[PDB]
Design a protein around this ligand. Structure first.
Ligand SMILES: NCCc1c[nH]cn1
Length: 144
């Protein structure tokens, strides 16, 4: 289960975006997501649009520059260390001690059949910490 690089994780397929599927973090807002655009492969920088479910059944949106530092995806002060990513469908990252399993928008109808490398890494790294499911099928589509 050789991981792709942090840049390959950030960029993913280069289209769509990622929903937070499971996390060790409690109190997370439903439909937490990130979506990259304006990918600069040379500089390994992108625009991130991110948010979660707000009012009126609409996703919130805030933008930030996303970049890479070592093996972490950097958004503001958040450095999310890439534990495993396939660069295509899912990522397992560590941020503020929390273990997070993110899924590409193309993978949201198969959450029981995700890349074994992603689920194995998430299950290993969370240890005895209870998981929380943040994604649901009724989450709105990502910002277009
Ligand atoms: N595809 C990477 C998703 C992500 C998680 N955290 C920051 N970005």
């Amino acid at each position: 289960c050789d991981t792709v690089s942090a840049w390959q994780s950030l960029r993913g397929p280069g289209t769509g975006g990622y929903y937070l599927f499971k996390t060790t973090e409690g109190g997370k807002t439903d439909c937490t997501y990130v979506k990259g655009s304006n990918f600069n492969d040379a500089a390994q920088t992108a625009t991130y649009t991110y948010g979660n479910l707000g009012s009126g059944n609409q996703l919130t949106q805030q933008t930030a520059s996303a970049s890479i530092s070592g093996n972490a995806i950097v958004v503001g002060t958040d450095h999310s260390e890439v534990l495993y990513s396939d660069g295509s469908t899912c990522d397992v990252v560590r941020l503020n001690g929390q273990i997070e399993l993110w899924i590409h928008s193309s993978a949201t109808s198969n959450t029981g059949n995700l890349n074994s490398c992603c689920t194995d890494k998430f299950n290993q790294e969370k240890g005895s910490r209870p998981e929380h499911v943040v994604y649901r099928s009724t989450c709105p589509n990502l910002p277009q």
